[PDB]
Amino acid sequence: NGPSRDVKLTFAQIAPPPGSMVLRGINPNGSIEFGMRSDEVVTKAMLNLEYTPSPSLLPVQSQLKVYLNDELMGVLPVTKEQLGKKTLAQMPINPLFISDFNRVRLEFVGHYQDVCEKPASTTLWLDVGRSSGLDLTYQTLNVKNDLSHFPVPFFDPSDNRTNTLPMVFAGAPDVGLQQASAIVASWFGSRSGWRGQNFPVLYNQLPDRNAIVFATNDKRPDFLRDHPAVKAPVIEMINHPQNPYVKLLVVFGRDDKDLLQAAKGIAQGNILFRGESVVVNEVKPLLPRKPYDAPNWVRTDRPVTFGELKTYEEQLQSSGLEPAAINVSLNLPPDLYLMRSTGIDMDINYRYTMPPVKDSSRMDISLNNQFLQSFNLSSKLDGKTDVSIPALKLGATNQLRFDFEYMNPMPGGSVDNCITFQPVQNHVVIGDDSTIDFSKYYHFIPMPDLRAFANAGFPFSRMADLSQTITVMPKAPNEAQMETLLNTVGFIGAQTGFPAINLTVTDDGSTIQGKDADIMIIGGIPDKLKDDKQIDLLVQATESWVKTPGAMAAVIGFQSPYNDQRSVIALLADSPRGYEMLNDAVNDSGKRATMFGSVAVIRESGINSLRVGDVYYVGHLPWFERVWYALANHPILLAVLAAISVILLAWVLWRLLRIISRR
Numbered sequence: 090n091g092p093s094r095d096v097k098l099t100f101a102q103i104a105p106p107p108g109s110m111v112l113r114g115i116n117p118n119g120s121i122e123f124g125m126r127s128d129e130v131v132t133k134a135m136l137n138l139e140y141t142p143s144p145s146l147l148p149v150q151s152q153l154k155v156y157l158n159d160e161l162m163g164v165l166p167v168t169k170e171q172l173g174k175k176t177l178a179q180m181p182i183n184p185l186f187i188s189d190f191n192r193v194r195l196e197f198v199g200h201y202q203d204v205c206e207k208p209a210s211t212t213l214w215l216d217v218g219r220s221s222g223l224d225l226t227y228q229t230l231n232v233k234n235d236l237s238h239f240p241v242p243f244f245d246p247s248d249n250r251t252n253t254l255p256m257v258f259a260g261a262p263d264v265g266l267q268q269a270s271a272i273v274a275s276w277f278g279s280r281s282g283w284r285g286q287n288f289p290v291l292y293n294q295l296p297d298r299n300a301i302v303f304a305t306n307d308k309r310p311d312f313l314r315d316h317p318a319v320k321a322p323v324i325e326m327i328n329h330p331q332n333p334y335v336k337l338l339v340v341f342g343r344d345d346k347d348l349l350q351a352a353k354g355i356a357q358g359n360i361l362f363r364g365e366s367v368v369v370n371e372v373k374p375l376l377p378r379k380p381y382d383a384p385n386w387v388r389t390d391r392p393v394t395f396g397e398l399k400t401y402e403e404q405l406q407s408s409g410l411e412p413a414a415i416n417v418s419l420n421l422p423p424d425l426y427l428m429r430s431t432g433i434d435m436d437i438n439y440r441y442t443m444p445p446v447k448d449s450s451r452m453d454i455s456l457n458n459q460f461l462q463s464f465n466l467s468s469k470l471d472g473k474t475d476v477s478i479p480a481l482k483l484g485a486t487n488q489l490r491f492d493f494e495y496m497n498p499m500p501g502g503s504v505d506n507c508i509t510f511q512p513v514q515n516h517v518v519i520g521d522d523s524t525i526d527f528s529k530y531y532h533f534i535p536m537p538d539l540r541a542f543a544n545a546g547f548p549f550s551r552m553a554d555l556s557q558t559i560t561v562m563p564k565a566p567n568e569a570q571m572e573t574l575l576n577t578v579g580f581i582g583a584q585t586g587f588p589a590i591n592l593t594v595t596d597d598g599s600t601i602q603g604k605d606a607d608i609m610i611i612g613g614i615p616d617k618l619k620d621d622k623q624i625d626l627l628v629q630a631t632e633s634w635v636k637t638p639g640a641m642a643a644v645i646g647f648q649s650p651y652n653d654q655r656s657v658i659a660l661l662a663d664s665p666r667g668y669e670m671l672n673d674a675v676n677d678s679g680k681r682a683t684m685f686g687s688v689a690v691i692r693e694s695g696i697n698s699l700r701v702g703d704v705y706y707v708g709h710l711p712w713f714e715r716v717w718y719a720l721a722n723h724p725i726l727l728a729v730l731a732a733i734s735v736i737l738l739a740w741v742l743w744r745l746l747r748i749i750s751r752r
Contacts, residue, residue: 098223120194121222128229136224137222140215140217143214146201205507207501242299246280255301257290260308294310297329300337302338303348325339384587392525392527435476450496452491493517536707537705539644546585553587561611563612573668573672605655613663644661
């Protein structure tokens, strides 16, 4: 037996509630995409359809095929009495061909006239209902308990849903255990990517999921008893003592240092986990990380050529009668200075198939579903394309999708004589020689803002490995403080492409005096003031603490009075219920992006965002070129400065004239 999940997914083709997709004679293919977890087995597959055929098609000579993976298992011909009203459709699918990946697509073949039919006509059309999709039930399988498939039993990069793995601790962690948990949590985030993370911690209890257990040979979580003492950090894959269906991950050691060493090995040496009970003895770094070298972010040392931006094999080309929209996902750091009116040029060298005659076909480059510019598609077949695309996103993932719109050439040809021909298809490819320029750009941005932090985590992800980062926690943190820390570092790890293994966590504010690093505030300050006046009072309340040493959830960020070059970030609450709603506010991207300014108070109903305090700037741009931007805004003042220089020239000329006369 075992637990089973009954998932329900609709057609992969876009179908907004305003209007569902229609299978016409020009595009009769509708594909459904799903993936397996490499651990579940399909027990019962069911497919439901609600189709309404037009009454202008022959019943017998019109059918639709159902494909699971390049094969058919049944057809559903339309009867004479079915052409008018809607009817349900039940089609079982044999669960034998579902190994790891399937493309369930349906094709429509129909006929409306015998002696002469016109392809891609309007009189024939098919549409499906809203509730039309596969109904397959998964089933948990007994894994062979092998550690070589890391991290497949914990996180398989094949699901479209967010993961949720708890991290049970030994109870009341200390200064030497929090940092190791952050390192492991961050490495999951660097692998989670856009799927999202959720890390609910526990204490002295074991859940019914694939959790992770931490032990230091002392104060074991009341189920690791009778285990002999270990002389080395041992990582096992023991199962749940009550049911052998979930897989845990215990980490052993002798003290705080031992567990930290084991955690670093997991996040770095993931390619040599063999068998079971893998031990690590010596893992040390050799070289630091160059600034702004996150794998997800595009590098600026030399212009890239879409070589590492493919992240797929058959993405830069399309085929078939209707070519698909080729898209490229790119992320850029938010440090690119604005107010330059320059843009980013392109060097696209796409090649296509020669059309027969001048069909006036056009190709348009779209950006975030917005029309930008269209070109011609005739070469009497390779065309150089240079364009500076404005209006980027600067922090969020912005796509550069563009499609190839082709009209049917010679639809009927002759009207008096019936002509029938097979539909001809064509291919298209963009090429890997197209480059974009990021050679010499300067880093400059107003620092006291949370939009950059909420989109890319700039105030903390300056270094890929987080060489300088200071986090403070109250003594003996409860579930809330650990829960909000693990998600936050995972958010930083998710945006970047390298786990944070060099960060540190302290327990008091005495060690941060004079330190040149990234100060981060997590926990709770005295919260007693009324709801009316948190806009201004909280500004000095947190500042007074940094210098020396129906719930509320406020995130703030201001200048750190230690270096005048780094930003502090503070997360405050009053009740554990506040932490839970604060985490839910940042986990989802639906409303988290709607957060700008310094102070962002989280309320039960809505989010009130405002900007207060004195702003400042970050980065190191040439001071000589700074005046160029300042003089740009002041047009009248620039003329006055030139006039003053010209007026002073006359005084020098008068003195020169007197000197010339005396000469």
